[PDB]
Amino acid sequence: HQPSDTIAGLYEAFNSGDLETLRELIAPDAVIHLPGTAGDAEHPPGTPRDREGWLGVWQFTQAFFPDMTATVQDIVQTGDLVATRCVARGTHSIEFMGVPPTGRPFEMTMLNMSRVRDGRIVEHWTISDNVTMLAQLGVKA
Amino acid sequence: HQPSDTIAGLYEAFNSGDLETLRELIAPDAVIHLPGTAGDAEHPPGTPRDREGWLGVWQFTQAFFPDMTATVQDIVQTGDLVATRCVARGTHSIEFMGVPPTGRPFEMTMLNMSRVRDGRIVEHWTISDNVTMLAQLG
């Protein structure tokens, strides 16, 4: 099952809130390298997480940016590896970091690389340009 | 050059300080999307830069992390697009945020994507795991 479709499906699933598909497309024991911003006490910056850890982080993000969508811009494959560039678009519609909602939009780059075996993600690296998002939210005209 | 070699050459050039090669491998009018951490007053987070802007930022980084090296771990290509995962290693020789140098090593992930036309980079996206670097520095 072609690895580029696995990754296109993954982001369609994240956008629609479709946990059943996400569990089909990601192995339970997949190694997920989230950036250091996603670290906590139990999981220091640079230590990997499993699928449910990743989905836990995603669930928490959906609470602050419920209209957020990741759109694949470029996609690149060689064998079981797939790399994507996405754009996350959304609004400041929920209060966060102590600032009440402004409605202001944001558009930030995500870069990802994933290893896909048997139609499922088994390793994944991702980083988002979080500082640019914050800059965009503090600058309308 | 096959695009994967252009990108391997690019990081060999950054590691050795080889500005002549970097100018061969990057078009002058290339669009460089650096992460928001690389912004300044003249160039807000998310605004692109040209080759000389990028090299200017790199030169400035070499003042604080003079032994820093990027090593390509994985590389992936399809047409003109190449994507890489690198590891930046260096040592903590300069005080930051009031915490003194330790001499300890640090290791952070970079992800990159580059468009290569006629053996030269014409567009480039990069992001580094900056928070992990700061955690490593203590």
Author numbering:
A (entry chain A): 6 to 146
B (entry chain B): 6 to 143
From the paper:
Indanomycin is an antibiotic from the pyrroloketo­indane family which is known to act as an effective ionophoric agent against Gram-positive bacteria. IdmH is a homodimer, with the individual protomers consisting of an α+β barrel. Each protomer contains a deep hydrophobic pocket which is proposed to constitute the active site of the enzyme.
X-ray diffraction data were collected to 2.7 Å resolution, but attempts to determine the structure by molecular replacement were unsuccessful, presumably owing to the lack of a suitable search model and the large number of molecules in the asymmetric unit as estimated using MATTPROB. The remainder of the structural description will focus on the unlabelled native protein as this should best represent the natural form of the enzyme. Electron-density maps were well defined for all ten protomers in the asymmetric unit, allowing all chains to be modelled, with the exception of some residues at the extreme N- and C-termini (residues in the ranges 1–6 and 143–148). The ten molecules in the asymmetric unit for the wild-type protein form five almost identical dimers. The following discussion of the IdmH structure will therefore focus on the dimer formed by chains A and B unless otherwise stated, as this represents the most well ordered dimer based on an analysis of the overall B factors of the chains. Interestingly, the loop, which comprises residues 99–108 and is partially truncated in the IdmH-Δ99–107 variant, appears to occupy two distinct conformations within each of the five dimers in the asymmetric unit.
